[PDB]
């Protein structure tokens, strides 16, 4: 069964609702220019109140390795999602202390060729024509499918690719920073086949 991550959480109530509905991970965007931005302190409060067995991920965009490590131990993250243009070295350094997921934007097979350079880490493909990923699926360990996913389309995207996980943030929102519980229920209901 596919895993589901709900990203850009900015408040407790949305996070908890996510957990109770079946979400396997919850994410916080530590990129200052995002509308879904949340401060380490506010994130800490949420992190700390969540049950175990639910991953806490932090999204960073071209941040310097030390800041990544500090936010991570402070907020008690379980993984780090490197969503910029980070070189494998930075990736490899971060990975010595905590698990990293590398995000890579994709729109044509040239992009999939760039992604293969990071195949040693789990990949989040930020994408749509799912089938163009197919000839590359087995070159990767674990693949997180993302981009434009919503309750209406997740199942189709899951049938074509069969990924480890699926990620979403605006496709289940009422507005930037605030989730819509019915959409979350439906997104998880549909993606997992419950
Ligand atoms: O959500 C944001 O604003 C944001 C900004 C900068 C970096 C990452 C961000 N989101 C983190 C996560 O990887 C995103 O959910 C997906 O790329 C967005 O999928 P969407 O729901 O917009 O299709």
Q: End-to-end distance of the chain based on CA atoms, in angstroms?
A: 10
Rounded to whole angstroms, the Cα distance separating 18 from 185 reads: 8
Q: 3-state DSSP call for residue 5?
A: strand
- For residue 62, the tally of other CB atoms under 10 A from its CB is 11
Any ligand 1 atom below 6 A from CB of 34: yes
Q: Name, in order, each residue with C-beta under 8 angstroms of 111's C-beta and a sequence gap of 6 or more.
A: 104, 105
Residue 94 exposed, middle or buried by CB count within 10 Å (0-12, 13-18, 19+):
buried
* HSE value, Cβ hemisphere, 13 Å, CA-based, for 173: 18
Structural domains present in the chain: 1-194 (3.20.20.70)
**Paired tokens of 67:** 């800041």
- Whole-number Å distance, alpha carbon 39 to ligand 1 midpoint, is 16
7 is catalytic: yes
Residue 35 exposed, middle or buried by CB count within 10 Å (0-12, 13-18, 19+):
exposed
| Residue from 190, 152, 185, 148 nearest 169 by CA | 148
- Whole-number Å distance, alpha carbon 169 to ligand 1 midpoint, is 6
Q: What is the DSSP string of 54-119?
A: SEEEEEESS--HHHHHHHHHHTT-SEEEE-S---HHHHHHHHHHSEEEEEEE-SSHHHHHHHGGGT
**Paired tokens of 62:** 């071209």
Rounded to whole angstroms, the Cα distance separating 130 from 142 reads: 16
* DSSP, res 122: -
Any ligand 1 atom below 6 A from CB of 150: no
| Ligand 1 closest atom vs CA 167 | 15
| Residue from 94, 92, 20, 105 nearest 58 by CA | 94
How many H helices and E strands in the chain? 7, 10
Instruction: Please state the φ and ψ torsions of residue 8, each to the nearest 5 degrees.
Output: 65, 45
- For residue 169, the tally of other CB atoms under 10 A from its CB is 22
| Residue from 144, 114, 140, 113 nearest 126 by CA | 144
Nearest CA to ligand 1 atom 5: 34
91 is catalytic: no
Rounded to whole angstroms, the Cα distance separating 32 from 116 reads: 29
Q: What sign does the dihedral 176-168-55-133 (CA atoms) show? A: negative
Pairing assessment for the beta strands 99-105 and 123-126 based on DSSP bridges: parallel
């Amino acid at each position: 069964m596919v895993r589901v991550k709900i990203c850009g959480i900015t408040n407790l109530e949305d996070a908890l609702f996510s957990v109770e509905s079946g979400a396997d991970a919850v994410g916080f965007v530590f990129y200052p220019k995002s509308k879904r931005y949340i401060s380490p302190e506010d994130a800490r409060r949420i992190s700390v109140e969540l049950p175990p067995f639910v991953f806490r991920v932090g999204v960073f965009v071209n941040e310097e390795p030390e800041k990544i490590l500090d936010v991570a131990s402070y907020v008690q993250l379980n993984a780090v999602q490197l969503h910029g243009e980070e070189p494998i070295e930075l990736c490899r350094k971060i990975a010595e202390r905590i698990l990293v997921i590398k995000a890579v934007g994709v729109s044509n097979e040239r992009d999939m060729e760039r992604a293969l350079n990071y195949r040693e880490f789990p990949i989040l493909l930020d994408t749509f024509d799912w089938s163009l990923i197919l000839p590359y699926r087995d070159r990767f360990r674990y693949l997180v499918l993302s981009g434009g996913l919503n309750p209406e389309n997740v199942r189709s995207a899951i049938d074509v690719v069969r990924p480890f996980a699926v990620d979403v943030s605006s496709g289940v929102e009422a507005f930037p920073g605030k989730k819509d519980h019915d959409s979350i229920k439906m997104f998880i209901k549909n993606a997992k086949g419950l």
